[PDB]
Amino acid sequence: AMTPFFWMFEEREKMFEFYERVSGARMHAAYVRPGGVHQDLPLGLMDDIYEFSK
Amino acid sequence: XXXXXXXXXXXXXXXXXXXXXXXXXXGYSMFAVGIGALLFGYWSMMKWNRERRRLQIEDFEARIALMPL
């Protein structure tokens, strides 16, 4: 099947915009740490999560 | 003043909603159009073959008419 791969990877590439705005690299992040969470969510992201989920 | 990430839900995006539903076709109604197209198909086709018979006999008549050939 060719279509369901490319149908979701458009949406999946939008998902790494959340990762880039919350941490340095695209995929792997040193974000979750023994001290909880390394860095707080920026002001732009919290409005984007609701916009994505809709 | 402290500024942090604010919470917003608004519509909650609707948690698990069905989108798949029956459309256009019902069941018995599709057979009325399906077999209905077949019955219309044969009746239209066989009338042309009867019109072909008008040409057919007339074509073979040319051979009988031509004896100097």
**Residue at A54: amino acid letter:** K
Question: Cα(A54)–Cα(A48) distance, rounded to whole angstroms?
Answer: 10
- Residues in A closer than 8 angstroms to B15, CB to CB, are none
Determine the straight-line distance between the first and last CA of chain A, rounded to whole angstroms.
27
According to the entry, how was the structure determined?
cryo-EM
The answer to whether B8 faces chain A, any CB pair under 8 Å, is: yes
Nearest CA in chain B to A50: B9
Q: Considering all CA atoms of chain A, what is the largest pairwise distance in Å, rounded to the nearest integer? A: 43
**Which are the contacts of A19, defined by CB distance < 8 A and separation ≥ 6?**
A25, A26, A27, A29
The answer to whether the CB of B13 falls within 8 A of the CB of A48 is no
**Which are the contacts of A50, defined by CB distance < 8 A and separation ≥ 6?**
B8, B9, B10, B13
Nearest CA in chain A to B5: A43
Q: Do B5 and A41 touch (CB under 8 A)?
A: yes
